């Protein structure tokens, strides 16, 4: 796994073209996330 840029603990990907996109994030240490909820679902076919 790579490393955080020096002096940082994560990377934020800020959307710069798709005005409706929200942010995406990367961590480089597994201990920096806890899988708190398991959500089971189906996508729904639009009408």
């Amino acid at each position: 796994m790579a490393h955080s840029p020096p002096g940082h603990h994560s990377v934020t990907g800020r959307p710069s073209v798709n005005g409706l996109a929200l942010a995406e994030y990367v961590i480089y240490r597994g201990e920096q996330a806890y899988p708190e909820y398991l959500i089971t679902y189906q996508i729904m076919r639009p009408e």
Partner: protein, 161 residues
């Protein structure tokens, strides 16, 4: 050591988690190629993931980050979709859950948009879709996402397309 507790749909905690799921669906630039065509989900179940060891491992690292960033963990709740969700909930996140080819290098990626994480549930780019029908837009098969507590600390800001 992991146990799954089911939340009742009547519980405010089920309801706030469902709302985050539903309200952060968006349209994607692939017109639904990777994750399918949908505006909303049918939530079938929401379970709380409980594991003392993985939790303590998370809070230990959280305190370290916090102490290197003026007592600010910069903690978020973010989605994660992965073929490896069963390994994750039992064994924790590790380098086997990393996206080697991701835009910001080899790490573990999370999304504010549930629909973005949905694109990775059957693999990178949606893989070959659901196991049963080979359909990236399957409306039948059950999918799973994780809603995760994530420590960002000082985050390097990448402006990007």
């Amino acid at each position: 050591g992991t146990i799954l507790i089911d939340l009742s749909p009547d519980d405010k905690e089920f309801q706030s988690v469902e709302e985050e799921m539903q309200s952060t669906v968006r349209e994607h630039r692939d017109g639904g190629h990777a994750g399918g065509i949908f505006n909303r989900y049918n939530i079938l179940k929401i379970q709380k993931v409980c594991n003392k060891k993985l939790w303590e491992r998370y809070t230990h690292r959280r305190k370290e980050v916090s102490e290197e960033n003026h007592n600010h963990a910069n903690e978020r709740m973010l989605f994660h979709g992965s073929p490896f969700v069963n390994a994750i909930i039992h064994k924790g996140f590790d380098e086997r859950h990393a996206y080697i080819g991701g835009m910001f290098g080899a790490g573990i990626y999370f999304a504010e948009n549930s629909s973005k994480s949905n694109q990775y549930v059957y693999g990178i780019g949606g893989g070959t879709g659901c196991p049963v029908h080979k359909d990236r837009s399957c409306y039948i098969c059950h999918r799973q996402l994780l809603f995760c507590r994530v420590t960002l600390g000082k985050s390097f800001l990448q402006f990007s397309a």
